[PDB]
Amino acid sequence: RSELTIVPDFYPTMVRNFNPYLATNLRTTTDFIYEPLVVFNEMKGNTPVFRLAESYKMADDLMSVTFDIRKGVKWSDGEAFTADDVVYSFGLLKAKPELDQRGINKWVTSVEKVDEYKVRFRLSEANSNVPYEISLIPIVAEHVWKDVKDPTTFTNENPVGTGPFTVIDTFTPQLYIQCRNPNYWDAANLEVDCLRVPQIANNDQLLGKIVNSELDWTSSFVPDIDRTYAAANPNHHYWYPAAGTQAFMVNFKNPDPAKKEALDNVDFRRAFSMALDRQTIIDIAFYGSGTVNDFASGLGYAFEAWSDEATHKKYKGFNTYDVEGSKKLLAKAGFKDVNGDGFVETPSGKSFELLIQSPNGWTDFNNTVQLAVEQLQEVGIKAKARTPEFAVYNQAMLEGTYDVAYTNYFHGADPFTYWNSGYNSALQSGDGMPRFAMHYFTDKKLDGLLDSFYKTADKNEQLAIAHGIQKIIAENQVTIPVMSGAWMYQYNTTRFTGWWSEENPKGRPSVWAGIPERLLHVLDLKPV
């Protein structure tokens, strides 16, 4: 019996709740107990990997999509998994919207049974991203939940699932073990017999247990990891691939004529970007946990699959640490120190200072701004750090009164979330809008491409649209991308091999609930 010790989440004690539809539950329910129809491998162009369903096909009008259920799949209790399960699950969520955590009801008007192994989702809007959203919704057993009078308080203590681990072998306040689904449709590929889940309340307890080498799969913050964890045992490894993008946003409509002259100048934005030392920002402010983002468009290495490598190379130098190239571009653009103070004045000769914002209390971001100031000072740009409370920092962007601001962004399964929220001109106005697109740069074509990204299910067409967005953003150096966050993930080779890593980058390696790829990952694990 091979047991794999995982820590998808911390708890003060173990409470037996495997209801996939409750916010508060055990983090080994989704994916392990209830297998999705499809798991999209986001790190790899968001390519779908077929599991419970064999295939899906959207209508050319993109108002509906059908899935073909794989035949022969059984619930850990022996019962057959069919379209009836899919139809029931979505109906349950449609009728009791609080069970719908992801808000899928927004997209799916109804789910109908085409036949025992084929289901059709009817949509309320043309959107080729719906199959991806559908994949994230857990499917339960109709023959079981139909008799569950209270799905909102039901704790599902003796789960009947389609996933690889459905048997609750041990359950105590300090530990629970979830073992192999005896009717698992893909048992041949499952070599791990059980999931050993130890109770760990916080980072302190985890650190102690992880350095002692008693864990296999974790996704927790580990301080001074190379010294504390890596050096303790040669079987101690970790891989932190790229995540969400972080950057400095410049205000194109700065109300100060002099500052605008600088910010609303593509060459100055490029100089500003070449002065930054990205790798140092990651190593110092983020303790080495992050990835350099030298994409002028901000695409980032989490989506290199979507990148037009030619557009990347062409502007990559404007997003690489280059002190003398910076001083030179500024010189060529007319930004000269006519005052004699060591700081560049605008080309029309006006003096200026740039206030760089970061929310009060966000230490890593605050330190990043401080480093940016030092670095900008080396090229003649006069900047000063400021740390207003988030509300003000946020209001200043929505009101367009700020100069420069460091910020992170939401990170989707593909580049859309970043590009749309960060650059769609329609998001720069209206009441209740976030700060993400508040740089005030506008381009009718760019918006056109963003709004068409999901209006085609033709991948290559969509891919072309991606390249189109990338070129517009990169050539205008709209913002100054700095880095990509890190996906936390540590693995131990003492008991298993096959782990994903920089050398074997099959996908997002984290063990957290919310990372569907963890199912495919556990399936690549082989005991030692």
Q: Print the SS3 string covering 248-297.
A: EEECCCCCCHHHHHHHCCHHHHHHHHHHCCHHHHHHHHCCCCCEECCCCC
Are 4 and 87 in a shared domain? no
Cα dihedral sign, 69-73-74-76: negative
* Cα gap 138→231, rounded to integer Å: 40
The domain boundary, picked from 75, 108, 141, lies at 141
Are 512 and 500 in a shared domain? yes
Read off the CATH number of the domain in which 290 is found: 3.10.105.10
Resolution of the coordinates in A?
A: 2.3
- CA-closest candidate to residue 476, choices 452, 513, 442, 526: 442
* Cα gap 436→245, rounded to integer Å: 11
Vertex 295: Cα angle to 384 and 315 (nearest 5): 95
User: Can you read off the two tokens belonging to residue 107?
Assistant: 């997209």
- For residue 251, how many other CB atoms are within 10 A of its CB? 25
N- to C-terminal Cα distance for the chain? 12
* Cα gap 426→442, rounded to integer Å: 9
Is 191 annotated as contributing to ligand binding? no
* Cα gap 74→79, rounded to integer Å: 6
Is 343 annotated as contributing to ligand binding? yes
Are 394 and 477 in a shared domain? yes
User: Can you read off the two tokens belonging to residue 202?
Assistant: 């916080």
Are 443 and 316 in a shared domain? yes
Structurally, the chain folds into a number of domains equal to: 3
Find the domain containing 42 and state its range.
35-141
Q: Backbone phi, then psi, for 92, in 5-degree steps?
A: -60, -45
Strand-pair category, 236-238 with 490-492 = antiparallel
- Region of 525 (left: φ > 0; alpha: ψ -120 to 50; beta: rest) is beta
**Beta strand segments in 74-138, E:** 108-115, 118-123
Asked if 302 and 348 touch (Cβ cutoff 8 Å), the reply is no
Is 133 annotated as contributing to ligand binding? no
DSSP-assigned letter for residue 208: H
**Beta strand segments in 343-445, E:** 354-357, 383-386, 404-408
Paired strand residues for 120: 66, 112
The domain boundary, picked from 109, 126, 141, lies at 141
Are 298 and 236 in a shared domain? no
* Cα gap 107→97, rounded to integer Å: 13
Question: What is the helix (H) or strand (E) element at residue 242, kind and residue range?
Answer: strand 242-250
List of residues 6+ apart from 79 with CB closer than 8 A: 141, 143, 160
* Cα gap 63→122, rounded to integer Å: 6
Cα dihedral sign, 327-333-338-344: negative
Paired strand residues for 119: 67, 113
Alpha-carbon distance values, 196 to 2, 193, 400, 472 (Å)? 10, 10, 52, 49
Helix, strand, coil tally for the chain in percent (to 5): 30, 20, 50
Strand-pair category, 354-357 with 404-408 = parallel
Is 90 annotated as contributing to ligand binding? no
Are 179 and 274 in a shared domain? no
What is the maximum alpha-carbon separation in the chain? 82
Strand-pair category, 354-357 with 383-386 = parallel
The domain boundary, picked from 107, 123, 141, lies at 141
* Cα gap 183→104, rounded to integer Å: 29
* Cα gap 308→470, rounded to integer Å: 8
Asked if 214 and 206 touch (Cβ cutoff 8 Å), the reply is no
Read off the CATH number of the domain in which 83 is found: 3.90.76.10
* Cα gap 338→394, rounded to integer Å: 35
DSSP-assigned letter for residue 437: T
Alpha-carbon distance values, 459 to 45, 68, 455, 465 (Å)? 10, 20, 11, 10
Are 66 and 131 in a shared domain? yes
Is 18 annotated as contributing to ligand binding? no
Asked if 492 and 479 touch (Cβ cutoff 8 Å), the reply is no
Are 218 and 322 in a shared domain? no
Are 297 and 183 in a shared domain? no
User: Can you read off the two tokens belonging to residue 58?
Assistant: 């959207």
Catalogue the long-range contacts made by 26-29 (C-beta closer than 8 Å, 24 or more residues apart): 26/176, 26/197, 27/512, 27/513, 28/165, 28/178, 28/195, 28/197, 28/513, 29/138, 29/156, 29/159, 29/513
Are 328 and 466 in a shared domain? yes
Are 189 and 304 in a shared domain? no
Cα dihedral sign, 271-272-277-282: negative
Tokens 């509906």 belong to 64
Read off the CATH number of the domain in which 160 is found: 3.40.190.10
Are 427 and 304 in a shared domain? yes
